[PDB]
Design an enzyme around this catalytic site. Structure first.
Site, PDB file in Angstrom:
ATOM      1  N   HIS A   1      36.781  28.860  45.425  1.00  0.00           N
ATOM      2  CA  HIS A   1      36.102  27.777  44.709  1.00  0.00           C
ATOM      3  C   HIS A   1      36.871  26.457  44.756  1.00  0.00           C
ATOM      4  O   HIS A   1      38.090  26.409  44.573  1.00  0.00           O
ATOM      5  CB  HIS A   1      35.904  28.188  43.254  1.00  0.00           C
ATOM      6  N   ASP A   2      36.127  25.370  44.947  1.00  0.00           N
ATOM      7  CA  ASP A   2      36.591  23.992  44.830  1.00  0.00           C
ATOM      8  C   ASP A   2      37.611  23.613  45.893  1.00  0.00           C
ATOM      9  O   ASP A   2      38.190  22.516  45.813  1.00  0.00           O
ATOM     10  CB  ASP A   2      37.145  23.710  43.414  1.00  0.00           C
TER      11      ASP A   2
ATOM     12  N   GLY B   1      42.120  28.623  44.342  1.00  0.00           N
ATOM     13  CA  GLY B   1      41.152  27.581  43.997  1.00  0.00           C
ATOM     14  C   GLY B   1      41.714  26.176  44.170  1.00  0.00           C
ATOM     15  O   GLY B   1      42.912  25.922  44.000  1.00  0.00           O
TER      16      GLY B   1
HETATM   17  C1  LIG Z   1      53.484  32.289  46.817  1.00  0.00           C
HETATM   18  C2  LIG Z   1      52.061  31.758  46.669  1.00  0.00           C
HETATM   19  C3  LIG Z   1      51.072  32.927  46.514  1.00  0.00           C
HETATM   20  C4  LIG Z   1      49.623  32.416  46.401  1.00  0.00           C
HETATM   21  C5  LIG Z   1      48.607  33.554  46.233  1.00  0.00           C
HETATM   22  C6  LIG Z   1      47.199  33.007  46.028  1.00  0.00           C
HETATM   23  C7  LIG Z   1      46.132  34.104  46.160  1.00  0.00           C
HETATM   24  C8  LIG Z   1      44.738  33.518  45.885  1.00  0.00           C
HETATM   25  C9  LIG Z   1      43.563  34.498  46.010  1.00  0.00           C
HETATM   26  C10 LIG Z   1      42.175  33.836  45.858  1.00  0.00           C
HETATM   27  C11 LIG Z   1      41.913  33.521  44.382  1.00  0.00           C
HETATM   28  C12 LIG Z   1      40.734  32.551  44.188  1.00  0.00           C
HETATM   29  O1  LIG Z   1      39.528  33.051  44.783  1.00  0.00           O
HETATM   30  C13 LIG Z   1      40.390  32.358  42.718  1.00  0.00           C
HETATM   31  C14 LIG Z   1      41.442  31.588  41.946  1.00  0.00           C
HETATM   32  O2  LIG Z   1      42.455  31.104  42.420  1.00  0.00           O
HETATM   33  O3  LIG Z   1      41.167  31.451  40.537  1.00  0.00           O
HETATM   34  C15 LIG Z   1      42.146  30.807  39.716  1.00  0.00           C
HETATM   35  C16 LIG Z   1      41.827  29.325  39.604  1.00  0.00           C
HETATM   36  O4  LIG Z   1      41.872  28.648  40.873  1.00  0.00           O
HETATM   37  C17 LIG Z   1      42.793  28.684  38.620  1.00  0.00           C
HETATM   38  C18 LIG Z   1      42.581  27.163  38.534  1.00  0.00           C
HETATM   39  O5  LIG Z   1      41.274  26.801  38.045  1.00  0.00           O
HETATM   40  O6  LIG Z   1      42.548  29.306  37.354  1.00  0.00           O
HETATM   41  C19 LIG Z   1      42.771  30.713  37.313  1.00  0.00           C
HETATM   42  O7  LIG Z   1      44.139  30.956  37.638  1.00  0.00           O
HETATM   43  P1  LIG Z   1      45.269  30.765  36.483  1.00  0.00           P
HETATM   44  O8  LIG Z   1      46.490  31.559  36.879  1.00  0.00           O
HETATM   45  O9  LIG Z   1      45.406  29.298  36.197  1.00  0.00           O
HETATM   46  O10 LIG Z   1      44.516  31.533  35.334  1.00  0.00           O
HETATM   47  P2  LIG Z   1      44.844  31.952  33.828  1.00  0.00           P
HETATM   48  O11 LIG Z   1      45.663  30.923  33.115  1.00  0.00           O
HETATM   49  O12 LIG Z   1      43.545  32.471  33.297  1.00  0.00           O
HETATM   50  O13 LIG Z   1      45.748  33.260  34.088  1.00  0.00           O
HETATM   51  C20 LIG Z   1      45.208  34.405  34.756  1.00  0.00           C
HETATM   52  C21 LIG Z   1      45.801  35.687  34.156  1.00  0.00           C
HETATM   53  O14 LIG Z   1      47.234  35.634  34.253  1.00  0.00           O
HETATM   54  C22 LIG Z   1      47.815  35.966  32.992  1.00  0.00           C
HETATM   55  N1  LIG Z   1      49.070  35.233  32.872  1.00  0.00           N
HETATM   56  C23 LIG Z   1      49.109  33.897  33.030  1.00  0.00           C
HETATM   57  C24 LIG Z   1      50.317  33.211  32.932  1.00  0.00           C
HETATM   58  C25 LIG Z   1      51.489  33.940  32.691  1.00  0.00           C
HETATM   59  O15 LIG Z   1      52.591  33.341  32.610  1.00  0.00           O
HETATM   60  N2  LIG Z   1      51.425  35.284  32.535  1.00  0.00           N
HETATM   61  C26 LIG Z   1      50.260  35.948  32.639  1.00  0.00           C
HETATM   62  O16 LIG Z   1      50.185  37.192  32.501  1.00  0.00           O
HETATM   63  C27 LIG Z   1      46.768  35.560  31.966  1.00  0.00           C
HETATM   64  O17 LIG Z   1      46.917  36.360  30.796  1.00  0.00           O
HETATM   65  C28 LIG Z   1      45.465  35.835  32.694  1.00  0.00           C
HETATM   66  O18 LIG Z   1      45.075  37.191  32.454  1.00  0.00           O
HETATM   67  C29 LIG Z   1      41.912  31.421  38.350  1.00  0.00           C
HETATM   68  N3  LIG Z   1      42.290  32.824  38.406  1.00  0.00           N
HETATM   69  C30 LIG Z   1      41.685  33.697  37.598  1.00  0.00           C
HETATM   70  C31 LIG Z   1      42.110  35.145  37.676  1.00  0.00           C
HETATM   71  O19 LIG Z   1      40.813  33.360  36.806  1.00  0.00           O
END
Ligand SMILES: CCCCCCCCCCC[C@@H](O)CC(=O)O[C@H]1[C@H](O)[C@@H](CO)O[C@H](OP(=O)(O)OP(=O)(O)OC[C@H]2O[C@@H](n3ccc(=O)[nH]c3=O)[C@H](O)[C@@H]2O)[C@@H]1NC(C)=O
Ligand SMILES: CCCCCCCCCCC[C@@H](O)CC(=O)O[C@H]1[C@H](O)[C@@H](CO)O[C@H](OP(=O)(O)OP(=O)(O)OC[C@H]2O[C@@H](n3ccc(=O)[nH]c3=O)[C@H](O)[C@@H]2O)[C@@H]1NC(C)=O
Ligand SMILES: CCCCCCCCCCC[C@@H](O)CC(=O)O[C@H]1[C@H](O)[C@@H](CO)O[C@H](OP(=O)(O)OP(=O)(O)OC[C@H]2O[C@@H](n3ccc(=O)[nH]c3=O)[C@H](O)[C@@H]2O)[C@@H]1NC(C)=O
Ligand SMILES: COc1ccccc1C[C@@H]1COCCN1C(=O)c1cc(-c2cc(C)ccn2)n[nH]1
Ligand SMILES: COc1ccccc1C[C@@H]1COCCN1C(=O)c1cc(-c2cc(C)ccn2)n[nH]1
Ligand SMILES: COc1ccccc1C[C@@H]1COCCN1C(=O)c1cc(-c2cc(C)ccn2)n[nH]1
Lengths: 263, 263, 263
Positions: free
Chosen positions: B125-126, B143
């Site tokens: 997305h985006d 994203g």
């Molecule tokens: C070495 C580099 C490796 C890179 C690997 C990348 C792999 C990417 C695979 C494709 C993913 C893509 O299709 C979708 C995507 O990226 O979505 C996210 C979206 O781009 C983002 C911004 O808008 O927001 C979301 O990511 P965030 O990490 O910012 O989400 P969040 O804050 O909801 O955290 C997700 C989960 O992590 C948990 N969390 C977060 C922080 C932390 O310190 N500890 C923790 O457990 C939190 O409880 C929650 O259950 C989105 N995710 C989710 C799961 O909703």
């Protein structure tokens, strides 16, 4: 020609000209092009695409969402009628891709027999996979790569174009192979480096104690003696005069084009 | 509306309202939703899912098991009618996924023209992918990622959300990109760090000797001078007064939100 | 038995004996074997294969090209009638694979409820995934792996067989996990090492300030005190007498077979 004992599911699309052997099974929603040959007893489970000039041996199991014979990803490829050959008793798992050759690379992608290609493994144009190999999930070969007999490649690992993965090698998961891996070697890392002889694999495959010792001594010549590869080549050939298993190094050196992985 | 010169395979399911252009081809077992537009000459080989509010240009080749326009993986997404735009002459290989935008992120996932998206590449997305890019097998964008014109991303590499992959960048395989990559830079590693200017790519794309030298001097300002980025920004702008190719750095700095990759 | 309120697309193939619950939806070109149970409201979007002795709960969303219940990739498996269990409200994305158990490993692959399994995640034979977990794109579990409640595993990461990913763990992307990860820990790298407590995750999930402090003190006992694990086990149990959240370490230690990840 479709053998009268083959099963072709009513939803599959087998193009006129395809050859389907005795007791083969073409499952639902498969597509089989007109230059495909599928050997006796081979199973396409469902949702499999096989096209191109592609010959598949007997008793293979090809799982759903695999693509076999497809146009390769080399930008140099222009649609020329290149080929895929696949042997017998392979297990080719969901989403595996095996792509046709290029004229520039020799015209042929080849896979031997008794291999296990796990989910989303990729066999690029002009690769040669031998017999009894394992590619774990997402293991990815660039074009022209050789994976020699009994070699195994761990999950998430990728191999740079033209590299040779030698016979009986074990490449760890989460690794990136950028140079050639001599036979019998354990390799791991990004980029992958050598970590001694695959002793346990040789033991399980019936290598004698004497042969494994000679192979370890050849490994020491390459990586521990401090000599150049040009100096050790005749020493390895000398050792092979007594222990024929060591000849695999000589044969590998003659094929190697990218230099050896090193610490 | 389906153009009278389009081919729609009898097993494909094209929902009423879909727009299919002249000489397009919808292969067997494809699904095309009612808000999809497929441009002239575009081919869906077989087993392709296209849905959502999704516009696809002309002369694209979309291979089996690709999913284009699908609901994204952001937990924040709630089903809002967001969009995908894809340009012309892309090669979108087996199992590629291109997901629709989020309201929070601007509502649009966009891909330009003349790109090669290899097996199982993921455009979240985006994201915004430009023109003439390459994503190798399993290259994975979180994203909101930008992949700028002519940038290439190697096999197995993933990019953290919001990062910018600058124009003409080469990101190696088996890498993890966690910050922004300036235009013209080679990046590799986990996490990825810079390894000089992509000289060979610029040479092949018609950049002059003078422009490449200026770009190398700008790279030195950023990574070798020892100054802060705030100090070098006006020095880079000054250099761009003579060599317009250097302006790409200025334009990139204005978009960068995550800081630059660094040694 | 197929509930009269279930929808089964005319192109889907549901084998006699399958159980399909009220208001479930089986989309086009899906295949559902005769020992499958699909709970109320669950959706198979299209092009999904579900087979084996496989029970799926309610309100799941299973996307195209997923394979659920399929024969596993363990060479030891010989076709024995093993099982898959999947709970409620999971989002199981394109190309995810969830494989049936082995007799040797207990006969059961199990997934709980409210999980998000992103594109091409792999759940091998005999794995146990809990509730509220996230596996990002290409996250890959070898056989027998446990992913405990609320744990998240980043993109491209793979986990070695039998390892435990503890409750509330965050494993970074591009990582390789070779040993057990205690609850509440952040892990990253190849091979993965610990990087402190997942404080932000605990905060968001309602853990008290006192509980997080106790968990940090338990982490310090394990990784900073310099004592052996055998010395700290009774100290952790003592701490859990006051802060019950610390008991998760005790419960984890009893299950751990591979040793803990360490710096
Ligand atoms: C070495 C580099 C490796 C890179 C690997 C990348 C792999 C990417 C695979 C494709 C993913 C893509 O299709 C979708 C995507 O990226 O979505 C996210 C979206 O781009 C983002 C911004 O808008 O927001 C979301 O990511 P965030 O990490 O910012 O989400 P969040 O804050 O909801 O955290 C997700 C989960 O992590 C948990 N969390 C977060 C922080 C932390 O310190 N500890 C923790 O457990 C939190 O409880 C929650 O259950 C989105 N995710 C989710 C799961 O909703
Ligand atoms: C740590 C190890 C990581 C390994 C990761 C491997 C992942 C492999 C995934 C499967 C790929 C396989 O299916 C296809 C394949 O390998 O094809 C190539 C073909 O085997 C090769 C030889 O015959 O030729 C091609 O690779 P090259 O790298 O040699 O091609 P090229 O010289 O055309 O360069 C490709 C692009 O890179 C750009 N480039 C090249 C060099 C440079 O220094 N900078 C740069 O930008 C260049 O402008 C061009 O756009 C082929 N590629 C392309 C895109 O055509
Ligand atoms: C940095 C971390 C990277 C992690 C990457 C993980 C990627 C996982 C991808 C998903 C795989 C999953 O779906 C299936 C799975 O994990 O199965 C195995 C099963 O969980 C296990 C236990 O029950 O048993 C098997 O693994 P083992 O490694 O224990 O099997 P084995 O002892 O039969 O060895 C497999 C091959 O390796 C060769 N070998 C083994 C040891 C050695 O030192 N050298 C060597 O060559 C040996 O000859 C044989 O051909 C099973 N495998 C096989 C091929 O049968
Ligand atoms: C070492 O075992 C290998 C190696 C190569 C090819 C296949 C296998 C069999 C295993 C299990 O069967 C499924 C596929 N496997 C893997 O991909 C695999 C790699 C690692 C690993 C572990 C460490 C510690 C380091 C590097 N890699 N752990 N598991
Ligand atoms: C360097 O070439 C690139 C780089 C980025 C994107 C595409 C390509 C083209 C190649 C071949 O065409 C298939 C895709 N490719 C790869 O993914 C790719 C990466 C590496 C690699 C090699 C080393 C030594 C280090 C890091 N990475 N080797 N091959
Ligand atoms: C840290 O965020 C995690 C971690 C584990 C599991 C899921 C997520 C959510 C994110 C975004 O939602 C899509 C999936 N994600 C990823 O896979 C993911 C990993 C990294 C990363 C970043 C760094 C700097 C180091 C290691 N890993 N960046 N993004």
């Amino acid at each position: 020609m479709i053998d009268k004992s083959a099963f072709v599911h009513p939803t599959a699309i087998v193009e006129e000209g395809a050859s389907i052997g005795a007791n083969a099974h073409i499952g639902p929603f498969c597509i089989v092009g007109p230059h495909v040959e599928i050997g006796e007893g081979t199973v396409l489970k469902s949702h499999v695409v096989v096209n191109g000039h592609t010959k598949i041996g007997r008793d293979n199991e090809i799982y759903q969402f695999a693509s076999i014979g497809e146009v390769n990803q080399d930008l140099k490829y222009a649609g020329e009628p290149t080929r895929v050959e696949i042997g017998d008793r392979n297990r080719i798992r969901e989403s595996v891709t095996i792509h046709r050759g290029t004229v520039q690379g020799g015209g042929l992608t080849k896979v031997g027999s008794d291999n296990l290609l796990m989910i989303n493994a990729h066999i690029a144009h002009d690769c040669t996979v031998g017999n009894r190999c394992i590619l774990a999930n997402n293991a990815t070969l660039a074009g022209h790569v050789s994976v020699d007999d009994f070699a195994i490649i761990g999950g998430m690992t990728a191999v740079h174009q033209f590299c040779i993965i030698g016979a009986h090698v074990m490449v760890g998961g989460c690794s990136g192979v950028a140079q050639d891996v001599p036979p019998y070697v354990i390799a791991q890392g990004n980029h992958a480096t050598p970590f001694g002889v695959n002793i346990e694999g040789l033991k399980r495959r019936g290598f004698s104690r004497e042969a494994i010792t000679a192979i370890r001594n050849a490994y020491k010549l390459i990586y521990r003696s401090g000599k150049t590869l040009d100096e050790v080549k005749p020493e390895i050939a000398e050792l092979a005069e007594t222990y024929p298993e060591v000849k695999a190094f000589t044969d590998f050196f003659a094929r190697s084009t990218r230099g050896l992985i090193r610490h």
